[PDB]
Design a protein around this ligand. Structure first.
Ligand SMILES: Nc1ncnc2c1ncn2[C@@H]1O[C@H](COP(=O)(O)OP(=O)(O)OP(=O)(O)O)[C@@H](O)[C@H]1O
Ligand SMILES: Nc1ncnc2c1ncn2[C@@H]1O[C@H](COP(=O)(O)OP(=O)(O)OP(=O)(O)O)[C@@H](O)[C@H]1O
Ligand SMILES: [Mg+2]
Ligand SMILES: [Mg+2]
Ligand SMILES: [Mg+2]
Ligand SMILES: [Mg+2]
Ligand SMILES: [Zn+2]
Ligand SMILES: [Zn+2]
Lengths: 278, 283
């Protein structure tokens, strides 16, 4: 059982759930780790990738998580990590909040059980990106797309281009054996509308295959990128793919398209070029 | 809750916890997915890597897991995945088994709360490797070393060279930002004594009462690639890696094949290499 902790401790005791994290400080890998408590991350899609991403961030001591998903836990989800069979029937965001709160009571939660692509929900979603930060009225520090479809990815895209919100997009192949993460700083890097998707492998009544392995690798690299981005250590990837068949992890950097369909991406690029010549 | 399933099914329904796995079949990734049920895997060390590894195999529908670990869950483990704070004070193997049985009732478990390295425990451990298969008296299909120290790793090595037991060794650095997996087929690939770990990891290891750091992310990645390798090995799809490293600071994932050292410290590794060379000479 774990009580609420006010300030993160370096103390090497069996009772300190943060001892092996704060250890990164004494070892000079991450010199200001406690900063993790000052950030808020939103996650859209608390499925295969989303849930493990949420677990990882929670165990790390993120200040605040915002979870968006419209689906309930089902037994068909039990091939993937996090959700357990007793949670079948609950909404994903609710199951997630319940477990994660149990795992780390220091983390703030805000959950929303809706589809983000409908008109009314979208206005709300944007409001929560802009105001749902650690301090209310300030924006979230990062948005994480862990949804499984074009429409939703495009929606996050539209929102983030308008707000000028840095986000990361993650995906997993329908054949389960490839995935990727991608960093989107609107104006500075290619937004999701800027180009066709980057693939890392070749090539109506049924479903996509999924493996707990691939989802764990993708969530892993995704959150690793988050930590590196927020805590300013190592090198952030703008794109990191994973091909499970070959054991291959291609990197890339996607530059903005100046005739991008999204007028706001165009505007953000403009703003970036202006800021660049100082 | 989840009901026992006698025969895995492709049927795409919300109540089928195997539907998305058996999808691999009709998508020509894995032609014989159900065969997963026929394998036994032993996991030594049920910590950061082990626990997630165990979970991954459990959800996949592994036939049987043998869990070996001498430690209790502590709040200090709560930085890594799987174990929850209410499990603090339980033995790792006990906590794991309980949770895993909940996650998939179809999987058989044999748990062992002891130190693999002591003289009497070692004998037992070898007995279980040889006989703890899905059918009693038959060996396990794979041993997975998810321990955190040289002594244990070397013990498994000794065991597996003598038994001719294929195993995978996994490790994460004390500084949390690198790790690797290695496939050891005694006589065909390098055993754990064949090459120095400092040398093996020279291109991935970042160099710094300290205690080891650990990250949920890095353990998640290592366990991920480890189990992905197990699945590719047993189910016969994709390319099995004999070594796959991970540097988290620079997103570098080196692979290499490693051939056995003919002057290996392990007399059994050497004997196995002979055995192998003979079998290739009479193929
Ligand atoms: N418009 C949307 N708003 C909110 N969440 C979404 C939206 N679209 C997709 N998601 C969520 O993203 C999650 C990630 O999908 P994942 O494929 O891991 O789960 P799933 O869809 O139930 O699995 P399967 O596709 O095997 O049934 C899902 O939980 C899904 O509900
Ligand atoms: N000889 C051994 N026999 C069985 N299990 C072992 C042996 N040596 C190590 N292990 C187990 O391998 C596991 C993997 O270690 P991990 O570092 O993930 O957890 P931990 O050692 O409790 O954590 P920390 O090092 O942060 O205190 C541990 O649970 C440990 O007890
Ligand atoms: Mg669903
Ligand atoms: Mg889906
Ligand atoms: Mg311990
Ligand atoms: Mg340890
Ligand atoms: Zn664009
Ligand atoms: Zn050897």
């Amino acid at each position: 059982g774990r009580v609420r902790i006010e300030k993160m401790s370096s103390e090497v005791v069996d009772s300190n759930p943060y001892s092996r994290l704060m250890a990164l400080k004494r070892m000079g890998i991450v010199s200001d780790y406690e900063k993790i408590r000052t950030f808020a991350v939103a996650i859209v899609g608390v499925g295969g990738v989303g849930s493990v991403t949420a677990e990882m961030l929670t165990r790390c001591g993120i200040g605040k998580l915002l979870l968006f998903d419209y689906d309930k836990v089902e037994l068909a989800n039990m091939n993937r990590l996090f959700f357990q069979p007793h949670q079948a029937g609950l909404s994903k965001v609710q199951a997630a909040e319940h477990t994660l709160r149990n795992i780390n009571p220091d983390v703030l939660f805000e959950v929303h059980n809706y589809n983000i692509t409908t008109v009314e929900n979208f206005q709300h979603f944007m409001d929560r990106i802009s105001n749902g930060g650690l301090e209310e009225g300030k924006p979230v520090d990062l948005v994480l797309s862990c949804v499984d479809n074009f429409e939703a990815r495009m929606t996050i895209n539209t929102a983030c281009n308008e707000l000028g919100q840095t986000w990361m997009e993650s995906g997993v192949s329908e054949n389960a054996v490839s995935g990727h993460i991608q960093l989107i700083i609107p104006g500075e890097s290619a937004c999701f509308a800027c180009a066709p998707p980057l693939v890392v492998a070749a090539n109506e009544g049924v479903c996509a295959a999924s493996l707990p392995t691939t989802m764990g690798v993708v969530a892993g690299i995704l959150v690793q990128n988050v930590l590196k981005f927020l805590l300013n250590f190592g090198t952030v990837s703008f794109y990191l793919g994973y091909n499970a068949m070959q054991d291959f992890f291609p990197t890339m950097s996607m530059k903005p398209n100046p005739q991008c369909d999204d007028r706001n991406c165009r505007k953000q690029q403009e703003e970036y070029k202006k800021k660049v010549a100082a």
